[PDB]
């Protein structure tokens, strides 16, 4: 049968126009009181996955 999208991926990741995989930075869900402003500020940004990890995740989004 045809492949199914991995919904965990689609809820976490976007394939950009040239095919990069973009995620949200980890590590500011909680435990934030002592964290620097520089730390939280930078962790609110998107980020690009390393090539090997991106291309696995891309295979889980076959119909984007």
Partner 1 sequence: MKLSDLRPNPGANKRRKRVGRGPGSGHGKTATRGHKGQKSRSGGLKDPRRFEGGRSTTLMRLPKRGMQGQVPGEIKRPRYQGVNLKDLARFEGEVTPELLVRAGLLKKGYRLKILGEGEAKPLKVVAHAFSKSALEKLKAAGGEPVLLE
Position 2 contacts Mg ion (CB under 5 A): no
Task: Enter the tokens of residue 37.
Answer: 């402003």
Map the footprint of partner 1 across residues 4-33, applying CB under 8 A: 6, 8-9, 11-13, 23-26, 29
Task: Identify which of residues 11 and 51 has a Cβ nearer to Mg ion in the complex.
Answer: 11
* Number of other CB atoms surrounding residue 47 within 10 Å: 12
Taking residues 28 to 57 in sequence order and writing x for each that binds partner 1 by CB under 8 A, - otherwise, the string is: -x-------------------x---x--xx
What are the backbone angles phi and psi of residue 22, rounded to the nearest 5°?
-115, 130
Longest CA span, the chain = 51
């Amino acid at each position: 049968p045809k492949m199914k999208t991995h919904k965990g991926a689609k809820k976490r990741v976007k394939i950009t126009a040239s095919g990069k995989v973009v995620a949200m930075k980890t590590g500011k869900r909680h435990l934030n009181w002592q964290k620097s402003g520089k730390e939280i500020r930078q962790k609110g940004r998107k980020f690009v996955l390393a090539k090997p990890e991106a291309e696995r995740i891309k295979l889980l989004l076959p119909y984007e």
